[PDB]
Design an enzyme around this catalytic site. Structure first.
Site, PDB file in Angstrom:
ATOM      1  N   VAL A 158      33.661  46.735  36.056  1.00 13.21           N
ATOM      2  CA  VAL A 158      32.963  47.076  37.290  1.00 13.21           C
ATOM      3  C   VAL A 158      32.485  48.521  37.233  1.00 13.21           C
ATOM      4  O   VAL A 158      33.171  49.392  36.690  1.00 13.21           O
ATOM      5  CB  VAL A 158      33.868  46.850  38.521  1.00 13.21           C
ATOM      6  CG1 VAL A 158      33.126  47.187  39.804  1.00 13.21           C
ATOM      7  CG2 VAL A 158      34.356  45.414  38.552  1.00 13.21           C
ATOM      8  N   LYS A 202      29.629  44.182  39.096  1.00 11.48           N
ATOM      9  CA  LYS A 202      30.620  43.497  38.274  1.00 11.48           C
ATOM     10  C   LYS A 202      29.904  42.649  37.233  1.00 11.48           C
ATOM     11  O   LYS A 202      29.001  41.876  37.569  1.00 11.48           O
ATOM     12  CB  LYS A 202      31.533  42.626  39.142  1.00 11.48           C
ATOM     13  CG  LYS A 202      32.673  41.908  38.414  1.00 11.48           C
ATOM     14  CD  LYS A 202      33.564  41.206  39.446  1.00 11.48           C
ATOM     15  CE  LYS A 202      34.617  40.307  38.826  1.00 11.48           C
ATOM     16  NZ  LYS A 202      35.395  39.608  39.894  1.00 11.48           N
ATOM     17  N   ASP A 211      46.336  32.753  46.775  1.00 11.62           N
ATOM     18  CA  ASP A 211      46.619  33.815  45.814  1.00 11.62           C
ATOM     19  C   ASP A 211      46.101  35.151  46.324  1.00 11.62           C
ATOM     20  O   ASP A 211      45.519  35.941  45.575  1.00 11.62           O
ATOM     21  CB  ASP A 211      46.019  33.505  44.443  1.00 11.62           C
ATOM     22  CG  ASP A 211      46.688  34.286  43.327  1.00 11.62           C
ATOM     23  OD1 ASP A 211      47.834  34.749  43.527  1.00 11.62           O
ATOM     24  OD2 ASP A 211      46.074  34.441  42.253  1.00 11.62           O
ATOM     25  N   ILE A 220      34.836  52.190  37.651  1.00 12.79           N
ATOM     26  CA  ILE A 220      35.788  52.302  38.751  1.00 12.79           C
ATOM     27  C   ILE A 220      36.938  51.313  38.594  1.00 12.79           C
ATOM     28  O   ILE A 220      37.972  51.448  39.258  1.00 12.79           O
ATOM     29  CB  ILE A 220      35.089  52.106  40.111  1.00 12.79           C
ATOM     30  CG1 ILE A 220      34.407  50.738  40.183  1.00 12.79           C
ATOM     31  CG2 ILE A 220      34.072  53.210  40.347  1.00 12.79           C
ATOM     32  CD1 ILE A 220      33.744  50.462  41.516  1.00 12.79           C
TER      33      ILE A 220
HETATM   34  C1  LIG Z   1      34.573  55.635  45.403  1.00 10.25           C
HETATM   35  N1  LIG Z   1      34.877  54.218  45.356  1.00 10.25           N
HETATM   36  C2  LIG Z   1      36.022  53.753  44.605  1.00 10.25           C
HETATM   37  O1  LIG Z   1      36.702  54.521  44.014  1.00 10.25           O
HETATM   38  C3  LIG Z   1      36.337  52.265  44.565  1.00 10.25           C
HETATM   39  C4  LIG Z   1      35.382  51.230  44.866  1.00 10.25           C
HETATM   40  C5  LIG Z   1      35.973  49.897  44.750  1.00 10.25           C
HETATM   41  N2  LIG Z   1      35.173  48.718  44.975  1.00 10.25           N
HETATM   42  N3  LIG Z   1      34.229  48.620  45.902  1.00 10.25           N
HETATM   43  C6  LIG Z   1      33.727  47.450  45.732  1.00 10.25           C
HETATM   44  C7  LIG Z   1      34.298  46.720  44.646  1.00 10.25           C
HETATM   45  C8  LIG Z   1      34.119  45.481  44.082  1.00 10.25           C
HETATM   46  C9  LIG Z   1      34.891  45.085  42.977  1.00 10.25           C
HETATM   47  N4  LIG Z   1      34.636  43.772  42.403  1.00 10.25           N
HETATM   48  C10 LIG Z   1      33.312  43.177  42.580  1.00 10.25           C
HETATM   49  C11 LIG Z   1      32.185  43.843  42.364  1.00 10.25           C
HETATM   50  F1  LIG Z   1      32.189  45.134  41.937  1.00 10.25           F
HETATM   51  C12 LIG Z   1      30.839  43.167  42.587  1.00 10.25           C
HETATM   52  C13 LIG Z   1      30.779  41.917  42.992  1.00 10.25           C
HETATM   53  C14 LIG Z   1      32.062  41.146  43.247  1.00 10.25           C
HETATM   54  C15 LIG Z   1      33.222  41.736  43.056  1.00 10.25           C
HETATM   55 CL1  LIG Z   1      34.726  40.851  43.342  1.00 10.25          CL
HETATM   56  C16 LIG Z   1      35.863  45.966  42.439  1.00 10.25           C
HETATM   57  C17 LIG Z   1      36.749  45.598  41.251  1.00 10.25           C
HETATM   58  O2  LIG Z   1      38.014  45.272  41.767  1.00 10.25           O
HETATM   59  C18 LIG Z   1      38.998  44.965  40.818  1.00 10.25           C
HETATM   60  C19 LIG Z   1      36.040  47.213  43.023  1.00 10.25           C
HETATM   61  C20 LIG Z   1      35.281  47.582  44.095  1.00 10.25           C
HETATM   62  C21 LIG Z   1      37.324  49.913  44.356  1.00 10.25           C
HETATM   63  S1  LIG Z   1      37.883  51.536  44.144  1.00 10.25           S
END
Ligand SMILES: CNC(=O)c1cc(-n2ncc3cc(Nc4c(F)cccc4Cl)c(COC)cc32)cs1
Length: 346
Positions: free
Chosen positions: A34, A49, A145, A26
């Site tokens: 991720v 992640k 930031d 994603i």
């Molecule tokens: C159908 N759903 C979609 O299309 C989408 C879902 C999401 N989505 N939901 C939760 C999430 C968490 C992170 N980072 C992360 C992580 F995965 C785990 C622990 C900590 C952290 Cl910071 C990122 C990456 O961001 C750059 C994207 C994420 C984004 S589009």
């Protein structure tokens, strides 16, 4: 027998607990690939992640350790909370990767910014951003930031901030997004809590304009966009500046700055009904109070939460939730590895 299994997502290898199934990518970028997945134990979708040897250098290590430590300090619905943390490696000497797990959201805030949003959704997103920032500040965390790429949203308009901000050198294809940083950060001034209000104003304005407000190759370009639009700051602001940076800023070409009706004309706003006419004027008013170069003149988080554009969502339980180790110094690769490993398995 073994608790873990491995699959190839994109071009990275994910070795995760067997409870997580059906891994799909994603997102990629800075410090982590991720995946979305189904958690068969919690019966819900999650995001996973991968931190690939976070201890490999100072920049990766300080951020990894810091965010693993800070996430136990905060507890708020608009701020990241992890469901799980694990490494498939068995001992410290074998340790390489950290996996972080949270609730699966629906979209990045960059995606939402590109949409036409009514005032109810815009004001609710901004209200939640301010609630989260306020919770961070109450815990002694000033972000500095905040940017849309680290903010995620669900279909029901709920929002979460995923990172904890600034404390460098990266030897990678990576590049840092700087367009939402306050003049205090651009100019090296020192700061207080309302440094984060600038970034919210930058997000706000980009929702209206659908263009980055202050783009640029570097801070040089960026500062030019700031003064071209808001005007040269007042002498009172100059005197806050270190003596060298002051010289550069005072010798920049002087611009008068556009009014906010011209920066954010009526065209950009829903304004067919009287309700929408009024909300457009309240939106531009708030913008004009958070896109303010001088932090002494910029609106505070608490006052922004009282603004008429924002306070229609107010509720004591959201803005003031009870707040809660330490931030560490320079360490070797070996020392960071052990610090992170020990935090991974408390
Ligand atoms: C159908 N759903 C979609 O299309 C989408 C879902 C999401 N989505 N939901 C939760 C999430 C968490 C992170 N980072 C992360 C992580 F995965 C785990 C622990 C900590 C952290 Cl910071 C990122 C990456 O961001 C750059 C994207 C994420 C984004 S589009």
């Amino acid at each position: 027998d073994n608790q873990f299994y491995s699959v190839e997502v994109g071009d990275s290898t994910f070795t995760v607990l067997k409870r997580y199934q059906n891994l799909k990518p994603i997102g990629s970028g800075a410090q982590g690939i991720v995946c979305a997945a189904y958690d068969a134990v919690l019966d819900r979708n999650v995001a996973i992640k991968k931190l690939s040897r976070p201890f490999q250098n100072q920049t990766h290590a300080k951020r990894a350790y810091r965010e693993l430590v800070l996430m136990k300090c905060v507890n708020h619905k608009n701020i990241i909370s992890l469901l799980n943390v694990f490494t498939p490696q068995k001992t410290l000497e074998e340790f390489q990767d950290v996996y972080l797990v949270m609730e699966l959201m629906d979209a990045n805030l960059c995606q939402v910014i590109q949409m036409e949003l009514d005032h109810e959704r815009m004001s609710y997103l901004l209200y939640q951003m301010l609630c989260g920032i306020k919770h961070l500040h109450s815990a002694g965390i000033i972000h500095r930031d905040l940017k849309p790429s680290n903010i995620v949203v669900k279909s029901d308009c709920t929002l979460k901030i995923l990172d904890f901000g600034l404390a460098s050198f990266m030897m990678t294809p990576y590049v840092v997004t700087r367009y939402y940083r306050a003049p205090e950060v651009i100019l090296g001034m020192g700061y207080k809590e309302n440094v984060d209000i600038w970034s919210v104003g930058c997000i706000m304005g980009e929702m209206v304009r659908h263009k980055i407000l202050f783009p640029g190759r570097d801070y040089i370009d960026q500062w030019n966009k700031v003064i071209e639009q808001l005007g040269t700051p007042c002498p009172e602001f100059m005197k806050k500046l270190q003596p060298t940076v002051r010289n550069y800023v005072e010798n920049r070409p002087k611009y008068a700055g556009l009014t906010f009706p011209k920066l954010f004309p009526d065209s950009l706003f829903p304004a067919d009904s009287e309700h929408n006419k009024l909300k457009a004027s309240q939106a531009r008013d708030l913008l004009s109070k958070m896109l303010v170069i001088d932090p002494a003149k910029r609106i505070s988080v608490d006052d922004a939460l009282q603004h008429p554009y924002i306070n229609v969502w107010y509720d004591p339980a959201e803005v003031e939730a009870p707040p809660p180790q330490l931030d560490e110094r320079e360490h070797t690769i070996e020392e960071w590895k052990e610090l992170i490993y020990k935090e991974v398995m408390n």
